[PDB]
């Protein structure tokens, strides 16, 4: 009735969607964008991939949508199908590893005035730095910039809207934890061209990682392997009679940790970390080797411990006396004294380089913990 056909028909004829509501030679199209992140289903620290969801809160205006008693009058705020809208090719600058999903075919907010918004529950795969410095105790801030794709400032402009945390809806099931999340705006003009280029929203995710699983198993075999090394040292005192035995456990030990480092490379390259870390294990453990090097080398360090009838009685006890001073010789080498210095020499030195391992390890977390 109320100009029924005359009102919707006229609207379709002199209305265009390819076009953008450009208003004179000025501020561009006033684009209002923001992140409304409520779920992070999957991400990989190793490949620095993030498939999350953020409703793309857009907000801008088009006067052409203003109306009178025949559209506003009908029902104040009316929601129009998005099609009529010029949709920006937004995209994650150093990210964007995936299409935004669920934005197409959606609803658009129109007002009596013209105000309009459309928050799409967009889910997509991203790509931002985490590098080997992603999961430390001291974190890294993933730089995530977002802004118009193929359109320059001379035609469209976006700007932040509000600060909101990253932990506002951060994953409690994450193998990480957040500290802070900031987002400020800017416009990037480049020395290349004298022109005024695109605008963008730069997010920075500051959060420390690393569950403690890998941690528990790195140190258990270490203390346990330090038990066998400790045995390594104590045995020659309490059972040097098993120095070879010691040898067996070094083939044991060695293969075990040489195999421990196998795990590392798989896990490490399977889950990212700053190399500076493995350096700890490196020398500390090459230390058990450097030390078993010297210690068992030293352990094996020693030459071989690693009438006339009255006459033969004398040729005989002679036979015995010769050998007796001789057996004294092999014991002359296994003095059972330096064995105690070697375990204590190294017990302290491992208690110290262990305490050294313990040192930067805890110093670094007296830095992280912060």
């Amino acid at each position: 009735s109320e100009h029924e056909t005359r009102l919707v028909a006229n609207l379709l004829e002199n209305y265009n969607k390819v076009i953008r509501p450009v208003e004179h030679h000025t501020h561009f199209v006033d684009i209002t964008v923001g992140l409304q992140l409520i779920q992070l289903i999957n991400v990989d620290e190793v490949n620095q991939i993030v498939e999350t969801n953020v409703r793309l809160r857009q907000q801008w205006i088009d006067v052409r949508l203003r109306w009178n008693p025949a559209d506003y009058g009908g029902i104040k705020k009316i929601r129009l199908p998005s099609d009529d809208v010029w949709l920006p090719d937004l995209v994650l600058y150093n990210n964007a590893d995936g299409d935004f999903a669920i934005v197409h075919m959606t609803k658009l907010l129109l007002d009596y005035t013209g105000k309009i918004m459309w928050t799409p529950p967009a889910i997509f795969k991203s790509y931002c730095e985490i590098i080997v410095t992603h999961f430390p105790f001291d974190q890294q801030n993933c730089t995530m910039k977002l802004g118009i794709w193929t359109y320059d400032g001379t035609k469209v402009s976006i700007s932040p809207e509000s600060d909101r945390p990253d932990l506002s809806t951060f994953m409690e099931s994450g193998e990480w934890v957040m500290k802070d999340y900031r987002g400020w705006k800017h416009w990037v003009y480049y020395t290349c061209c004298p022109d005024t280029p695109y605008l963008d929203i730069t997010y920075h995710f500051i959060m420390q990682r690393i569950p403690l699983y890998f941690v528990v198993n790195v140190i258990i075999p270490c203390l346990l392997f330090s038990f066998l090394t400790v045995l390594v040292f104590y045995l020659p005192t309490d059972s040097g009679e098993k120095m070879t035995l010691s040898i067996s456990v070094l083939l044991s030990l060695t293969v075990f940790l040489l195999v421990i480092v196998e795990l590392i490379p798989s896990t490490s390259s399977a889950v990212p970390l700053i190399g500076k870390y493995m350096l700890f294990t490196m020398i500390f453990v090459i230390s058990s080797i450097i030390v078993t090097v010297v210690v068992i080398n030293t352990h094996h360090r020693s030459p071989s411990t690693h009438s006339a009838i009255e006459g033969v009685k004398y040729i005989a006890e002679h036979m015995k006396s010769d050998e007796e001073s001789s057996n004294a010789a092999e014991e002359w080498k296994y003095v059972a004294m330096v064995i105690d210095h070697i375990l204590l020499c190294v017990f302290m030195l491992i208690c110290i380089i262990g305490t050294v391992s313990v040192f930067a390890g805890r110093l670094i977390e007296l830095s992280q913990e912060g």
Binding site: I286, V293, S304, I309, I315, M319
Partner: protein, 369 residues
Amino acid sequence: VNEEERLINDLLIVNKYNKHVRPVKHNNEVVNIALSLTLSNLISLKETDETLTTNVWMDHAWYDHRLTWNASEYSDISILRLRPELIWIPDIVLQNNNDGQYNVAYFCNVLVRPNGYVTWLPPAIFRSSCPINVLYFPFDWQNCSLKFTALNYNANEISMDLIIDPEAFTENGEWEIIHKPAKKNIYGDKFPNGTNYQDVTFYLIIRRKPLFYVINFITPCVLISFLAALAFYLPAESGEKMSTAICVLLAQAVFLLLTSQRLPETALAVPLIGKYLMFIMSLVTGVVVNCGIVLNFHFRTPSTHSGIDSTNYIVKQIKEKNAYDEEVGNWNLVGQTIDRLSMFIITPVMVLGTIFIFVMGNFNRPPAK
């Protein structure tokens, strides 16, 4: 209104303009088309099979003579937009690297200049089979060659004239980008009786190799080598650890074998040259051999590996007698040979160990040449 309705009706892009017709001012020499290549990122490298996934900004230019506008088009705004289906777009084919169709570098928004000149340049996630060859591993690490251009048109329907590769080289690559030259061209061939399609030839000369595999891999060699090295020092300090010494062979042996096993694994993932792969396995074999040597040399020797007077004389007899046995063994001991063994172990380790980094150098000098 300045003839605008009428004029874009004049252009009607799709209806008045021949989009299925390329405005090359009819049959002549060609439409002056130019391509610009800028890599935005390199995400994956596969040295072994000569394949690369890389992103490029497909900067394209050509003048659309039917695109020239008038006041209510041209001057109304000396710059405006028009989709791909309403803009002539060159059929740029990645000549030797498009064995993986181009993505979102396809039918995308283009830029409309005022006097017909048009500009289309979107992002290209692509896969390529660059000139790796088994020569993309020596230190020069070859030169990756690539040609870009409008596939469909020839030298009388298209002319494309002509940026560093490391400009957006990926920093997470296991290689290093040394240079990237750019020069266009045009070329006919033997079976073709006419010249055609001009193209963007961009050679990428790179290099790669870790300074990390060297770390944990040679590391065990001087460590392991000292075991085999000590192996021969240890036969002296206490060769009596026969069985236990034997244990270590099993143990240094199982260590050796799968160490080599990890080697091809990463190998297949990387086409490794024959020159380097031998020094590795040649020398671990050097110890393998000497482990077998260890065997024999360590277990090689055949053995070392008046009535009352009557009675005690019996004993002095049994005395001396097995003293001959006892000694038949030290005959075998071979101890004045000891130092020479470990001396002639030192000498060779020095010879070969040096031979390698000697060779390391004799090839390290000429590339630096």
